[PDB]
Design an enzyme around this catalytic site. Sequence first.
Site, PDB file in Angstrom:
ATOM      1  N   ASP A 155      40.659  41.248  48.530  1.00  0.00           N
ATOM      2  CA  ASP A 155      41.982  40.840  48.066  1.00  0.00           C
ATOM      3  C   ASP A 155      42.985  41.925  48.354  1.00  0.00           C
ATOM      4  OD1 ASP A 155      40.905  38.472  46.980  1.00  0.00           O
ATOM      5  OD2 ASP A 155      40.979  39.170  44.903  1.00  0.00           O
ATOM      6  N   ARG A 205      40.318  29.842  49.775  1.00  0.00           N
ATOM      7  CA  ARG A 205      41.022  31.117  49.980  1.00  0.00           C
ATOM      8  C   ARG A 205      40.499  31.863  51.186  1.00  0.00           C
ATOM      9  NH1 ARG A 205      41.678  34.387  44.279  1.00  0.00           N
ATOM     10  NH2 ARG A 205      42.615  32.713  42.984  1.00  0.00           N
TER      11      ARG A 205
END
Length: 324
Positions: A155, A205
């Site tokens: 991330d 994602r």
Amino acid sequence: GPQGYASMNGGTTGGAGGRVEYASTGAQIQQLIDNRSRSNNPDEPLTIYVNGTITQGNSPQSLIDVKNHRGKAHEIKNISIIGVGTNGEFDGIGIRLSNAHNIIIQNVSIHHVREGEGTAIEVTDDSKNVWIDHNEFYSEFPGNGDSDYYDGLVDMKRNAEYITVSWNKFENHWKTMLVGHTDNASLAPDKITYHHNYFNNLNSRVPLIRYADVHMFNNYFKDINDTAINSRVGARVFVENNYFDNVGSGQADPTTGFIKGPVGWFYGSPSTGYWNLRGNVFVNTPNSHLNSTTNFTPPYSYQVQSATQAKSSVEQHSGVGVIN
């Protein structure tokens, strides 16, 4: 060195050309970082070869904190963390880069990260020039069915910039990669390249992109259950010469109405991002509904294989035990 955005802004050499240490516990890694930070020469390049399994039990914090000891307002610079063979393993503990500059993480496996940020590598607090290469990241999918039990694999948040993610395997996970964690343009990362990764058996994602300019080339996406590339709030993603197999459910997203597939706008944020599509191969992957919505191309030189050549290269050369 890296292809793509980590090659800009001066390049990324990590810990090359300084001290070398070998560590096999999180305590050794954290001490090396903190001791250097407190020294007379805190930016002296440091390569840490990881030759044991790093865990919650052998680490002093719930994550490996690549952060200056004087906190995130101060930079930490010039580090490589490199696995030895197939022995550089982080089991249940992830790495966080915070205001970290010129950093390489290479040839490690990081997995089943629940504690800490619950994320295998978090790149945040204005970090720049980071190369994440030849690693493997995973947890379980569907596992126990709780998409939030683990958090992310890689991330990027809070103005992280000039980042290349290459030659890694991301597998068996729900919420794979974020680029921008909230709809706040002033905190968005920018300038991320993903190339030659294997993205396999994931829910979503891949990445979730808010605002940022991103280049994805020569990746192999496989068996992605819900959606892959999600471009939101003015993101621009150049999707070039990737191979997709069985990616996306094909169902309309209940929030945006977009067909769930390899790229689009899904789930949330107040407006769409954009995508420039060229040279991709889609097998059993919804794609006829797609149009390029931006001409965005990244500002750097690079070499790009065909999608099918990339598929074979990723199969053979992604992940750990290849480079070191």
